[PDB]
Each structure stands twice: as structure tokens, then as C-alpha cells.
Amino acid sequence: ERLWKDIKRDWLLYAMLLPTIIWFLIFLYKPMIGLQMAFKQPWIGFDHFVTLFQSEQFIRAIKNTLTLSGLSLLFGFPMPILLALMINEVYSKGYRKAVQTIVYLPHFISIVIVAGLVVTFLSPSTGVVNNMLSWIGLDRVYFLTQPEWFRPIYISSNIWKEAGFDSIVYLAAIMSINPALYESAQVDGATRWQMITRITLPCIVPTIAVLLVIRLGHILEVGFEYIILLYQPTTYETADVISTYIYRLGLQGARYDIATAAGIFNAVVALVIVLFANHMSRRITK
Amino acid sequence: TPFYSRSDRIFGIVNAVLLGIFALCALYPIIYIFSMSISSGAAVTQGRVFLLPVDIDFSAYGRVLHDKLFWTSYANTIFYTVFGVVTSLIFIVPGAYALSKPRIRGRRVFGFIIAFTMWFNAGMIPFFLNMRDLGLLDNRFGILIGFACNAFNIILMRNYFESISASFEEAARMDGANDLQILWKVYIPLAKPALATITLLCAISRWNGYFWAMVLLRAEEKIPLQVYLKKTIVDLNVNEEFAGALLTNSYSMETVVGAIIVMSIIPVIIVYPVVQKYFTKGVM
Amino acid sequence: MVASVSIQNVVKRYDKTTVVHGVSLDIEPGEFVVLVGPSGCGKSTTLRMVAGLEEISGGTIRIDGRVINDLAPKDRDVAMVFQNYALYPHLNVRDNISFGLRLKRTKKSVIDAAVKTAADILGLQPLLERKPSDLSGGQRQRVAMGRAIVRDPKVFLFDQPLSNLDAKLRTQMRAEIKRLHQRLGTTVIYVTHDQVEAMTLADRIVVMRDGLIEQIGKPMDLFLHPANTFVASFIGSPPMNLMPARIAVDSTQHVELNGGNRISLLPRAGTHLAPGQEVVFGIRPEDVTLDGVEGSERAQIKATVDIVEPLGSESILHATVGDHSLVVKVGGLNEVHPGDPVTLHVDLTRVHLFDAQSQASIY
Amino acid sequence: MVASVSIQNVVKRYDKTTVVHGVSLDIEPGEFVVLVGPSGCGKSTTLRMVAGLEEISGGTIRIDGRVINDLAPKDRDVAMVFQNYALYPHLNVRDNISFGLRLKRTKKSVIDAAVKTAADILGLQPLLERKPSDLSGGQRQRVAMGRAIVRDPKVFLFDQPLSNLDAKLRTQMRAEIKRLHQRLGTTVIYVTHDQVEAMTLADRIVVMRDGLIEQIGKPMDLFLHPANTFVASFIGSPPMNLMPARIAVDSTQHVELNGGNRISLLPRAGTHLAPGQEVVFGIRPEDVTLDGVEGSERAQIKATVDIVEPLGSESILHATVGDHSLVVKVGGLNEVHPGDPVTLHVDLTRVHLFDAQSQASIY
Prior knowledge:
The complex is a heterotetramer, with one copy of chain A (286 residues), one copy of chain B (284 residues) and two copies of chain C (363 residues).
Chain A: H1 2-9, H2 11-33, H3 47-53, H4 58-76, H5 78-88, H6 94-104, H7 111-122, H8 128-136, H9 150-161, H10 163-174, H11 179-187, H12 192-217, H13 224-230, H14 236-239, H15 242-252, H16 257-284
Helix pairs in contact in A: 1-2, 3-16, 4-9, 4-15, 5-10, 7-13, 10-12, 12-16, 15-16
Chain B: H1 6-38, H2 41-45, H3 59-65, H4 68-100, H5 107-119, H6 124-133, H7 140-146, H8 151-163, H9 167-175, H10 180-190, H11 192-207, H12 211-216, H13 226-235, H14 240-247, H15 253-279
Helix pairs in contact in B: 1-15, 3-15, 4-7, 4-8, 4-11, 5-8, 8-11, 11-15
Chain C: E1 5-13, E2 18-27, E3 32-36, H1 43-51, E4 58-63, E5 66-67, E6 78-81, H2 93-97, H3 99-102, H4 112-122, H5 137-149, E7 155-159, H6 167-183, E8 187-192, H7 195-201, E9 204-207, E10 215-217, H8 219-224, H9 229-234, E11 241-246, E12 254-257, E13 261-264, E14 279-283, E15 288-289, E16 300-310, E17 314-320, E18 325-331, E19 341-346, E20 352-355
Parallel strand pairs in C: 3-8, 3-9, 6-7, 7-8
Antiparallel strand pairs in C: 1-2, 1-4, 4-5, 9-10, 11-12, 11-14, 12-13, 14-20, 15-19, 16-17, 16-19, 17-18
């Protein structure tokens, strides 16, 4: 009919789409078949769920998961927006350029190198951080062993590395606003703080909303590769997160079914929380 | 542009200072280890550095330079980055080109297929298991074809294609050019900006890629840097060989670590200007 | 080469959305015909259907004896000049023109004779080896034309070619196009949203509103005798004065409008006007004068001046009668001190009347 | 309210790039003055300097007695209507207009009274609670104007306001602007790249090429007596016919051009031109007629027809003399079958002569 007619016209174009479709089927959707692993082996199943329901090590990981998700949203997410505003207000040209190169750069530093930077900085009697404390008489602290310090060390290292590169997007958004909106406001005698509150931010809101529902999409997996590297036995309590718990059991511990199932519980909620995100985003913000 | 009010001028200055302060905090660790790597083991071990190198001696670098695994693993990433990108490009660039033209029947459903993978994933273990029975474990090509297509890199590529006026394709068709030869002759050199942001994101993804590499790989000779970097840099437990080397050398563990990560980030610090040089050419 | 294209009941359908309603047009060989109208009309859609860039949802169209409905754009013996810069910015100008022909034939095709002509035509001797990156929009559109004319088609296709060009450029390219058709003479169909380009270039003008086809005829036919109030309001340098009026006392003699004003009417045979009939009274600004040099008596209207805009040796007068205002174009540079009353003199032969319901040309 | 702005030797410097060259202009209170010229000129830059959006690199400018050079845009008693949509797309129309006044608030009654006025002027009452997202570009520019007039400044500033609007809209807004100045009367400075808007709206026109200031005067002064060949070519509906010519045998009597043609000249005292002097002979298309000027007493130009473009009740004639072609605007259609010779008749009073070196107005 219609179909067959185009399929000859676009055949070469229709060709290109296939390997990409083949790939996604094989490496993404085909593993989705393995989701039936909710039955160890020979099916069932749904029990280890209630076993995964009850663990004193697990129930704290999820308790730690959404906890870490809170602080990441609190401190981590708004910071690149802040950085974007702070850069936009910079005159002097190249000076602003200099700031951008410096601040953006840590993004390209590997996460495992970042971790290494942390362990070498926070090492007792060796690490420069402890040394600087001994200078002013703050004594010394072993940071990686203390569960108290784990999260502050993380989110601070995360905003060092990623908050600059994330600021590019917001910075690029506020650069897309026609100056007429700003110039006419200056004519009415607006102030820099008045502007960023009454025009800049409101104009950028559609951007920060979209980025938020993406941020919420991964909100349960936050800090996976960082934690898995640096988390000590003593900090196991606060540091362990569902994604980590899954890894330890899934790959290290070689327990698949209970993990894959715990994988589902993480995946569904993530798919849930992004739906509750997207709704309230599109609805209220445009 | 025009300066003026005090409520600005003061605000403007304290902004540049605060941002400057933040900027120094961000540049600090980079200049630190650069100095610390050059410094001497005894110096770093107690009170010194904090900014500048101290007793030099340059001895930590000699260790890593004769490390074969280091240079072995470095080679693996260069392999993985170069070929991994190309495999991604070949799977994405034409794939999005097809996805761009809305004469396709599947345009509705094929888009859903790809995009659905964004907000829902099979999970950690099922991906690994599918890697297992596909026989791709401990295999370099398994790493390459394992991660090539990203949903984001596709819809971004299709959008730039869609962004281009169809008049180019139309003009080509009027002259007789059909599809793929349109893609390579006109749409691709038109797509250079989209091509940039893609080949870049895939690049760094390969270079700094760690997890799935160390999980899917067994043979040490296939290990891609950051995996090998994990062992030495964070875990920080070493052979007696290196322990024996500590006393006969006068560099330190920390100084070696410093030198290692320096040699690790230089090519990264390298592509960054390339990256920067890249985006502001006026790109749509 | 010189060919005739016939379009019969051609209709394009998107989803359920019957975009063009079966417009039918027959085009003489060597004829310059212009499609013109407002936006969101099938002017382009029709042209594109001719080119083969869009499918025919019904009806047939053919060039000479060849039915091109199921044909391919390559084999349709047509060439198209698009609205936005159809030239590839990487290739050089010489390579851009010759592009279609280097796909196949080389060495016996020569290509040099053909490019020589086209180069000679738009005068691009110094520009042969140049690149679109360092060319003017007009030059870009010129070489784009070179692409078409090097193909040597039966029909030329133009989709709003000068639309993206500046005004100063439009008047130059417009002369060059008319001049070009005198030189070459190939059949050409032309699409514009601009009334001006239609009146100038076209042998015949066909106006299309919202998918339908409003009228066909020589430039002066549409100007002198518009089919409806739309055709009347569209063409002409200013808009024609469309205000409502009535008949009352007698029919073929007097027509009165809201300004407590009354106009005697020329008899005109074939008129059949009804006494009392709701009507709109059209008149062109050039067909309206001031107090009257000559005249006079029963040929005029009384008004009070709103504003006067001096342009050239001419001037645009805005005068207010009733609840509505009419615009008259007066010759000169005198004094029209706004706010005082004024008498305008209407030309009796050029008046036009349209029914209020049946929006078409009664008088 | 109604105030005078004086601009004295104002110069703007970017890097080393002295953009405007010390343009000086004095503006009467309540006067409508239009800056006009090609692109890349300081027309906008001057305007922006008045507003205070750009710094004054030299010279002084002042409104009334106030020197505003070091002042702030807020305190400059000015309002500006920008080229692209200066309205915030989130706020409603009512909030957009009142925006500047709600910065310091001070009452919701004071601002409420002001919007009532401005809404009534432009007919923005039903659109009060609407949003820029669902408004027409003209309506968007209308409410943008409301923003300015609600400030009640001493001076109105316009930077190419109608530039982004369509042609049909330009003619409507242009009438509305002139009409508005009659109603209000506040001093206004106006910037355009379009010659048309300048001639219509302005009490005085000042033309600026490449940072300098070319001429100042009433619309008809620049039209009747251009300072140079540029001012001559810029203004007027078509361009004035600028082709080169000479003097030879005698001076104040005859002028001959490349077409083996010779034109007798009116004496025009104080001219004192030299025989043989290199010159360019200007004439306007409206000032040239056909052979119908009955037998040609003064022995007028001879020509051959290139092309004829019918527009309205008028027609654009392209005729070719020597190596150059001149354009004449003829009322009619007639038989002008291109390719045959034709006789054109020049108006002797409206001729203009310019020296080849000193590009300025000899005759």
C-alpha cells in the first residue's frame, strides 16, 4: 500500500536504522528478558523479595540511598545554576574565560582519579589536609574510616568535579536571552540582583525543570562509582547504597536472583519517580 | 554593558572575587599533585609542599615509566577510545539520520524503543548476564560493541539533522542523489557541530570509563588504565617489590601516586582545549 | 525544452487535512505563470507536487504528453530554485552548478559549454572558483539559478526565490528574471507571497486563498476586474478602498455610504443591482483625487482628514468618512493640515461594487 | 514632557574603532526626527548613547539643561522601543506595561491609572490579561510601545521598531505612529534602515552613512535638493537615475551623456560650472516621460527599451542609453514592445548634477 511504496524509496535510509535497532535489542532489551531472574535456579521467586525486604544491612542502604539523594539534590544540583549566574555577571572577558577553564576542567578528571585525590589528601600523618590542620592546631582526623565524614567528603568532591561542567548548560541558557529584556529593565533602573531574580531565573526555569527530571531519573544511583571505591568497613553503614548493595551481591557475592530482583525494586521506583517528576514539571512549568 | 549604579558595581566586584576564590579551590588540587609528584618522598611525608615542589629529585616518575602494566593499560584506553568512538559513530550517525526524516513508518515506534531505555533499564546484573552468554566477557570487541549506542547521543544527532532545512536533501534528489550519498556529501559536513559534541562525549566516556571495564575484563593485558589505576591509586596496597623499592629510591608511595595520576590526566588536559576550541564556532 | 504543463483536479491530502481542493490549471508553452496569495496556501504545495517532492493524492498532472504523477523528480524534466539557498556550502561555485551533471556523464558531456552559457547568463566570470561561504545572498541565489538552467529542463520551478532577499535586491533580481525569460523563454511557474512580483513578471496570474483557486488572468484583468473583495484587497500598490455601502432610492443611478454621502453610478450593462442591496464600495487611491482640478458636481464625496504621509513626489492621504476611513493617493507635495474637512473626487469609471453575502464582483 | 535634546560632537569609540565621528544634532521640543541610512552605521549607536545603554567616548549630549552623559538610563527621563520584542513572555500584558513602575511600586492605584490611558490609546484593553505567547508581532510591538508611553518620558526612542514586521503591517503601524505623535506630541528620535518610514514620519530627516552625518533637513529638502549622489540614490521610491555625463562646447547651456545625446540646461544662477567638467547626471523616474511631451523643444534624450514591468495603473520602464541604462516611471501600460527604440522626455527643472570627484550637488 502506502508502506511498501516508501520502504523502497527509503530503503537505504531504512537500512541505517536497523543496526541501531539491532544493537538496542541485543544489549539493552535482550537483557530485559533476564529480568525473570526473580526466580533463582525452577521458578520462584517473589520470596527472596520478602527476604530482600528483611535485612538489617539492606534496609539501611535504601535508608542511605534516599538520604544521599536528598543532599545531592540540596547541595549538588543548585550549585551549577549558582555557578552559571556567578559566571554570567563577570566582566573583563578573558578573566571569565580563565575561571571557566579552571572550573570546567575537573569534569575531565576520572572518577577513580578523584577518589585517589581524596584518599591521598585525607590520609592521616601524610595527607596535606590533615597537615594543614596540624598547622593551626586542629590535630588530625582519619577521614575515610569515620562514617560521620563520608557524605560531606563525597558531595564536596562531586561539586568540585562536576558542578562546573554542569554549569555550562545553565550558562548557555541565560546567554540565549535577548538583551532587550535586560536593557529595557536597566532603563527602568533594575539592579543586578533584581534582574537575576525577576528575569534571568524566570527565563531559565524551563531549562532547570527539564534538567531536574533527568537528575531525578538517576537519583537512586547517585555516587555509585565513588562509594564502591572508597567505602571502608567502618563506613559501611552510612556509605552503602542500593546500587552498591546490588553490586556487592550481584557480582562480588555472586548472588544474581535476589540482586536482579533488588534491581527491579530500584528500577521501578526510578521509573516511578521520573513519572511523578515529568508530570509535575510539564504541568506546572510549561 | 554600561556600568553605573553602586548596587551593581559592588555586587559585580564581590562576584568576581567569590568566583575567583571558588576558581582557586578548583585549580588547587591540580597544581598540588603536580608539585607533589615532582617533590621528594621525605619532603611530602611530613610537613612540606602545600603548594610548590620542595626537594624535587624527580624520582617518582622513573618508577611509572618502567611500569609495563601502566603503559599496557594506557594503550588499552587509546584503543578503546579510538575504536569505541568509531563503533559508536557508525551505529549512531546514520541511525539518527534515518530517525530524523519523518517519512519513516517506524519513526513513532522506533523512537520509543530507543528513548524508552533512558528512563527504564534492565538493571545491573541482567546486563552482565547477557554479556556472559553472548561470549563477550574478557573480550575487547565485547567492550567496544558492548557500549556504543546511547539514547541521548541518538536523539541529539537526529535533532541536529531535523534542524537542517530539508532543501539540501530535496535539491540532491532533484539532481538524482539518493540517501546515503546525501548523508556523506552534504548532511554530514553540515552536521560537524553535532558530530563534535558526540565524538567528544563518547571519547571521554571511553577514556574515563571504569566500572563495566573492570567487571567484564579478566586478562590484565586488556585492562584500560583507570581499572589498573584503581588498584594502585585508591586501594593502595602494593607488592613487597615496591616496598623494597621504596627504601632504595627515596621517592614515596604518595609521590609515585602523584606522578601516576599526572601522567594519567595529561592527555585529558590535552583534549580539553580541543574540546573548548570546538564548541563556539557559531554552531547550531 | 519549450513545453506545456497541464494540471487537472490536483489534490493533496495530509492526514485528513485536504490541503489543496482540486485546483486545475493549464499552462501554455513558454508562458510565465505566477502563483500568489497569503501564507498557509497550497501555492508551494502545488509547485512541490509538480517537482515531485510531494505525492499526488488525487487528480492528474502532465508535462506535454508525459504523465508525471508516478514519475521521479529526476525524470520529470524539471528544475527547481528553492527559497533558502539550495547550494552546498562546501563545494565551489563551479562544482555547485555542475553538480547534477557530474553524477553521471563526464568526458563527452564536456560540461564546459553548458557552464559557459550559465556563467555568461548571470555574469559569474570572476565567481567560478568561489565558495558560497564568501558570497552575497543575491549572488548565492544567482548561482542557484545557474544550477537550474544548466539542467536545461522543460519547466522552471520557483518557490519564493527573492523572499529572503532584501528589498533593494528584490527589485534587481525581479528585473533580471523577467529579462532572463525574454532571453531563454522556457516555460516557468512562479510562487510568491508578494503581490508586486506577481504583477510584474507574470504573463498570467493565478491567485490562491486557503487551498482553493481564486482567479486566473492577465495582470491587468485582476487589477481592473477583481473576482471578489479579496482579489480586490490583495493586488495594487496600496489596498483598494473597501468600505460598506447601500442603494436605497434608486438602483443603477445612485449609491450611498455611511458618510451621509451619495455617489452617482455609471449605467454599466449586465449590472442587475437590487434597490436597497447590502454592498461594499471599492475604489483605488489613485482613482481618488482632492477637491477636483477638473470635474465635477455629482462625482464626489465629503470627508475630514485623519493624516497625510509624504512619500515621494506623491503623498499618501488618510481621510475619514463615516465610521470608516478611506485612503487616497494624491499627486504632489502640498499642504493637507490634518483635522480640517476636505472634498475628494472619485473617478466614476473605476468604481467597484461587491455584494456583502456573495463577496463577488457585482459591478 | 515636551523637551529639547541637544547632541554636541558625540563620538563613540570601541577598541580603536571610532564608530561615530562626532555627529552633532540639535532637536526642537515636540519634534519628530528620523535617523536613516544603510547598515553598519551609528544610527542605533547614537540612539543607544542617548538612552545610556552605551558610553559616550567624547563630546556631550543633554536633555533640556540636564547633561545626561554620566547619568543613568533610569534618571535620563527617556523610554526606548527596541527592535526585537522587549516584552517578557512570562508576564501578562497588563504586567508587562506596568513593569517599570512596579519596580518601586509605591501604589497599585498610581500604576492602575496609567495603564488605563495607554491601553485606550492603542486599543490594548481587551488584550490586558493576555500573554506575549499568544499575541501578534504587531500586537507585541503595540504593547511594547505601551510600556514606553506609560513611563511618560521627555524623549521617545525608537530602534528599527517595524523592521521585523511584515510589509502589510509596516504601512499600518507607520500611520499609527504619525497619528500617535499628533495625539501626544512628545519629542521623539526615530531610527530606520528604510527610506520610506523616514520620509513619512519625520519633521526633519538626518541621514548617516558609515558613522558620519550626511545631511539634515525637511523631507522635501532632501528629496528636492540632495547634498550628494548618495543622498540622491537613497531617498525616493525608485532610485534616481545616476549616470555619468559631461559639458563640452558650452557650460550653462548644454549637457551631453554617453548615449550620443545632449541635453539643454536651465540657467540656475550661482551654479558657475566649468566646460568639460566630469559629472554625473541625475534624474528621477517620475521626472521622465515618454514622447507624449509633444515634439521636444529642448532636444531630449534618445533611448532603446530594455524591459517594461507593469505594476499598478503605473508601469516601470527600463530603457537603455549608452553603456548605461536609466529607469523611468510611466503612467500607463501601452505598447512598449521591448527591443525597439523609444524617445524619453526629461523634465528640465528637476535635473540634478554632481561632480565626479567632489561627489556633491553642483547644479
